[PDB]
């Protein structure tokens, strides 16, 4: 029912668009004000914040959210540190988007419940679409 999306790039904005269209509460958070404004029309609440900051994550009651999506791709350290801070905050399920295999390995060892690699996973999906 209630979801949080951290990082509002192309991937995260798509997650927010689908989640809200399905009829759920989505807290969209991105350090960049332009993307938060872009996603403000779609999501229930759009907040400009740095999720690498521990006190900001404490203030945003992410432990109350059923699922938290971390969609930071460019800076691997940002995604790893956001995952660590979210896990320390008490978030039970953390979904993290990873662009590289080393990042996926690190995130798996940290404790992310779901690691999403968009290029490989769509590779498999479109291969299955081509087969049938």
Ligand X SMILES: Nc1ncnc2c1ncn2[C@@H]1O[C@H](COP(=O)(O)OP(=O)(O)O)[C@@H](O)[C@H]1O
94-97 vs 67-70, strand pairing mode? parallel
25 CB-contact burial (10 Å; exposed 0-12 / middle 13-18 / buried 19+): middle
DSSP 76-105: HHHHHHHHHHHHHTT-S-EEEE-SSHHHHH
69 binds Mg ion (CB under 5 A): no
User: Is residue 47 a known part of a binding site?
Assistant: no
Distance CA 19, CA 13 (A): 10
From the list 28-36, 38-46, 56-64, 121-129, the region that binds its own copies by CB under 8 A is: 121-129
CB of 36 to ligand X, least distance (A): 8
| Contacting residue, 3, 11, 65, 95, with ligand X by CB under 6 A | 11
47 CB-contact burial (10 Å; exposed 0-12 / middle 13-18 / buried 19+): middle
| Contacting residue, 61, 64, 77, 92, with its own copies by CB under 8 A | 77
- Torsion sign across C-alpha atoms 90, 87, 83, 20: negative
90 binds its own copies (CB under 8 A): no
The site for Mg ion (CB under 5 A) is made up of 9-11, 73, 119
The site for its own copies (CB under 8 A) is made up of 1, 3, 9-19, 22, 24, 52, 67, 69, 71, 73, 76-78, 80-81, 84-85, 88, 93, 95, 97, 100, 102-103, 105-106, 109-111, 114, 116-131
The site for ligand X (CB under 6 A) is made up of 6-12, 29-32, 35, 50-52, 71-75, 78, 119
């Amino acid at each position: 029912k209630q979801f949080a999306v951290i990082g509002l790039g192309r991937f995260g904005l798509a997650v927010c668009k689908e989640l809200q269209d399905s009829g759920s509460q989505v807290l969209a958070v991105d350090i960049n004000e332009d993307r938060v404004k872009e996603a403000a029309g779609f999501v229930s609440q759009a907040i400009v914040a740095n999720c690498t900051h521990e006190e900001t994550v404490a203030e945003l009651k992410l432990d109350d959210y059923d699922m938290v999506m971390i969609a930071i791709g460019a800076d691997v350290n940002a995604s790893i540190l956001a995952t660590l801070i979210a896990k320390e905050a008490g978030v039970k399920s953390v979904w993290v988007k990873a662009n590289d295999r080393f990042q996926a390995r690190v995130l798996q060892k940290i404790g992310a419940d779901h690691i999403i690699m968009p290029e490989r996973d769509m590779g498999i999906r479109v291969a299955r679409k081509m087969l049938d």
